[model samples]
Target chain A: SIYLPLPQADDQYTPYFVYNFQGERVSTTETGVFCLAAIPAATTSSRYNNQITIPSIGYRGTLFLLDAASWWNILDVTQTGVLFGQPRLGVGVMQTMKTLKQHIKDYTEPAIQKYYPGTTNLDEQLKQRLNLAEGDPVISMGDTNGRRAALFYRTSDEKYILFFSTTEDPGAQYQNLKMLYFWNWSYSDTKQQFLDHLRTVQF
Target chain B: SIYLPLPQADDQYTPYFVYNFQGERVSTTETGVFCLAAIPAATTSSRYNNQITIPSIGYRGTLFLLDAASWWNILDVTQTGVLFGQPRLGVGVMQTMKTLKQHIKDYTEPAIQKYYPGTTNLDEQLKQRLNLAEGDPVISMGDTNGRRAALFYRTSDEKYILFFSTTEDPGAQYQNLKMLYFWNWSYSDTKQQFLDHLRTVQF
Candidate 1:
């Protein structure tokens, strides 16, 4: 898993990171071809819903069409907002290490996984690969300040694996670099199976 | 040797294809880093004094700078005047193919090479990669009467190989049902290398 020389990871381990692709509301759930969630300019969360995806490889250069959506599962629109904040953490020791799991275990009960499985030092792993220093791999909230999302572009190697970290995390001061990198997810019994699926991915 | 994808023999291979990058030149050199040579408005041959360079991976899309005169060396720049009468024969196949090769050799040829020996079927390999059905690549010698060159982008297995048949040979034709993707180098000795670079790439 760490052998791949991903974009930002260099000849090192791939960092664990999540990026917004598009932030839109599912106006209707009538099984339609996937499209960007057109969050009407009439919302409070962030006033924006357009999100971008960050390919698994890592940050490379600019964006590619590959970031375009293929199929996305839309959770019912709620008063949600994402703050695209800058990652302020880094690798090496001394750095405060917080993870998606750490948050879930602290907040929820039964140590249940909300969505993605809480792993051990996954944040560290992400830091090792991407030079995402102190502020990096930091827990970001739902709003990357409504900027674009970071994605693991599947194509173009030399300059793939990148992001639009979207200016600052919009509201980095109040929450600052204390947001979630979308680590907590809807946990379920099949969480183990889902992680197994993750193990096989190359990019 | 042919197992891996590469550029064709006849195609005017360059590290990166200039997709109307500028659609019009800002000044003289304007392709990537090294722009083509600037031939006066009234010249027998259109000199590309500046050898075009393919991006190592920059910008969201392929970003080419102008490196005329300095970076690259021009092989030959003869007018495609006769090619005007027979648009089919815009730039002389030999000249076009050779100039294209110059682009390839200038870059991509690393000190050490892997995979296939990047010397043998460089041109053939580059040509094979370029396959545009009928004639997707057409180089206009000049607006009034100048040499033009182009290649047919052949798609195979979600990758695009190019082909630049001869100008007078009347043998250049293309066909492909594969998906289209773009990457580095103007087909040359580094064709395979470029393709391989794409494989190991994350961006």
Candidate 2:
């Protein structure tokens, strides 16, 4: 009864995300596996199959789905093919604010503020405990299964991105992913489910 | 009272590691910091000033520590270097194996197996749970401070190296670190103090 926001792939261009383990694809018929889908590469942009522009996360650069054989579902954060910072990786639309209290570092308070943006700031909590201000970047995550992993961090001087993945194999799910793409109709249903699932998550 | 192995520099030829935070260098008199020391260029068989080779980690293929301004301590796993995997990053000589039980993933069991070796045999643990074998690469870590981070994983086919770093900021503590090199002469006093300090660590 895990979260499944998108429908099954109806065509080569219909975008869907699935829970993947290594090379095995867990179709919508599975349970307890974490997964996420996004607007397909072709549906969102007319340029490269990998380029993406998502306002939710403030990304307007090219996002390449690496060879599933080597990259799993992690996308490449590059500019004109020149890799700059880390890429987005997973299906986690849930607020990751709980992690800030335990994981925030001294130098990256600003990053944590940007990540949470408002009231649930983890940087403030840690600073209050240590009675200080400012520190380094906090780059970390948690995973119990290779089935899912999420890394959230500041990508550059002015941007931050989170990487959510369901496989450790680089390109294990690319083939199937290429067969799915997200449309406006799909986003309407998927976005709400993401919030619902987040409600059920524990700290 | 934290673990402070190694000694001050003997010469530019002697190998040593240091704690770094961004570009600031802290001496041995700091608190709430977890630092590490490594070799300088001329000490080892190096062609680059920051290039180093540690046999214990099986990194004979020159490992370079570039300026923190550019290369994050997270080194690029390159092809020409044929990097075996994982590099050290923290002050933890004590075991961190307890983390494996909760963090181990389905795809990275082999990596855990390599990390624990004949001890926990992570491959066997997940196998008993899932009754499966073989998966993709597992790359993960945990960090609370920019001062320290723990990375555990396999290098390639036959190697699994763990990198524990003490800083997210480059050259954070190079000045005082230059003074502490773990040589036989210093081993008598510094090693035990390091162990004693570990016992009282709160966070």
Candidate 3:
């Protein structure tokens, strides 16, 4: 049976390629969680093919779709260790919101500084994008050069959705950028939506 | 007032050299925590002196004493970026026991595999050392080459202590190896012991 299948091409979403990632071994007892990074259909691909791997146990995993003019702006998928070395996005069995908050900050703060250099007032910008209140729990980071952004938002269910995006018409130099979305099946509202799209495809 | 001071020399514990580590920044509002690695007096040091740097805030930090035949076995203190890049040992605010358990395993599993390639049944060995039950919360790793071991034990208070040690009399090759101990001040029972030993020393 197919587990955590890819989302179908629709009016709101169009996938260019799918890369299945085997989760790192976290414990001897627990089954390793899987992650899928889907490149948007709008982006150009060198291989333009689907790379898939199925896990032994199928219950929980994360899926993130990437949308950008150039895949380079997103990540280097061709690299040997990129698939295993990439940072994972999910709350563990007993992970607390506060530790999760710190984890998000540790990743995004350095990322934003490295990508954006001297850009300031990141908190205010994230607040503006999400229409968040003063103490709302949300963490975001972006690349000014590629006009690419990613954020982790805590839903009312205490689960998180990691969203990635680029401006629709950032500038004349970069006109092919489009928004990306990551639907975390763990979320209460999005679980059915993810399950509805699940289907067996040619491996 | 001095904060998180070094443990003084005693019948049980003796001082060698101390390395003060400035904690990495974690958040905008929260104060960065500090860490101190103290080498035992038995080990020969090219520079047998104390290195200390006090943090701006005095409330929280971790202190660990290294006891080994050669300082090289514990860690290379002379190298640049080692202090900042070393793994931290502490349960963050609101961090769950399970998450902490995973954090400990993530650090130790690879370490043991790297240090002791052919060793087997590590879980049973750790349980025997600590006299812990099967489901007790404990994670440990060791280097067979150096006879060095480190462990994180979650106490009744839900806080943890990170301990490092080497066998006293392994063989002629490792005659000088000794046990190391890390006293986490956040642990309830050890809090007073840490505070009583706290004192201002020459910077």
Candidate 4:
């Protein structure tokens, strides 16, 4: 099977078995900018236990895709996401999405916390947002204040602690969000491959 | 056998098989934060292929323990830690450490980039700092102005991408940081038994 990188903006396409948001074609110019490159997974680092790869055009690094409920618990007071990070964080989170639509909709942060219980700084997070694709859709824990990206880490025990990024930068929208679900320490080769695949045309 | 949560700050005890910085024992205080708890590595998710765990306090997530040389490559213009994040980046990195002294010394980032290839902001990263336990030992990619914490991500294939943090927070000394070496999912009743044993610890 030939593997192609995600389609470029203006080149709406999909790969074999790639996620198609609600049977919709992924557009490089929209929130549909995701790739299921199915790159043969490899064990490059001992730090990574379970693994999956998502090809994309925006920024790179680890990104989590959780259902509305699971993510809610994280943002809510349970703070179990950190504990849950180990036993069922990675491949499990991806497995929960039955379709590309569910996956895309999940990114909407439908459970966005309008009022977080802690951190005045966190209550302030509800105001941040990122536009996903060409629609009115904006992704955020809540509010649409233009800060769309979120970061998280799995503890050595597999628990996770998440943080809301406060950096205000350019092209910070859901449409521009790319998840490099897996990566290794060899940033050059892997990063080059990541960049190359992101630009290649697959059939 | 019984499982016990990690010994706390006042406990100052070592679990049976934890890593000892050289012949020195691990203490709750000071820089002796280490663990070999072997908390059942689990993956309710399918993505994980390898596993390891670290016991901790002061926040949980990923941490790297490289000799100054290996870290320098990542810190240097190569920025290969992201690539290094992939192949043989963990535990193996430790295996390369013949002595803890060598390991701690390696954190020095001896291979500093006099001229960072790009991004003034990143060119600016070379200038962060952290104080080791004693000896006026300071750790940094470049600038050592007190704030010394970092963050990283695994590649889509399970390698890693690391970043030096720039937060000026308290208790950010050697007391902070946790390591996640490997883990497996499927925490069975017996797996819970493993957890019990880790906590109970053997003499």
Candidate 1 lDDT by residue in tens digits, A1-203: 11000011112111222211121221111111111111111112221223434422121121112222322211111111111111111010110011111221222222121222122122333333333322122111112112223322111121112222332332311121112122111122133322221110000
Fnat of candidate 3 = 0.00
Q: Which run of 10 residues does model 4 chain B get worst, by summed lDDT?
A: B1-10
- Candidate 1 stretches greater than 4 Å from native: A1-123, A127-203, B1-180, B196-203
Q: Write the per-residue lDDT of candidate 1 for residues B28-114, one digit (tens) a residue.
A: 121111112111011111111222232121112222122112121111112110000011111111112223333222222221011
Give the lowest summed-lDDT range of ten residues in model 2 chain B: B78-87
Q: Number of the top candidate by TM-score?
A: 1
User: What is the lDDT for A144 in model 2?
Assistant: 17
- Which 10 consecutive residues of model 2 chain A have the lowest summed lDDT? A78-87
Clashes of 4: 65
Taking all chains together, each candidate's TM-score versus the true structure is: 0.19, 0.18, 0.18, 0.19
- Model 3 chain A: which ten-residue window has the lowest total lDDT? A2-11
TM-score of 3: 0.18
| Prediction 4 TM-score vs. true | 0.19
Model 3 chain B: worst 10 consecutive residues (lDDT sum): B1-10
Candidate 3 local lDDT, B1-203, one digit each (tens): 11000011011110111111222223211111212122222222111122222211111132222333322222211110000111121211111222233333332222111112122223333323333222223323222122223333333333333323332332232223222222122222132333332211100
Displacement of the residue B43 alpha carbon in candidate 3, Å:
20
Here, model 2's chain A TM-score works out at: 0.22
Interface RMSD of each: 26.0, 24.8, 28.0, 22.6
How much lDDT does candidate 4 score? 0.18
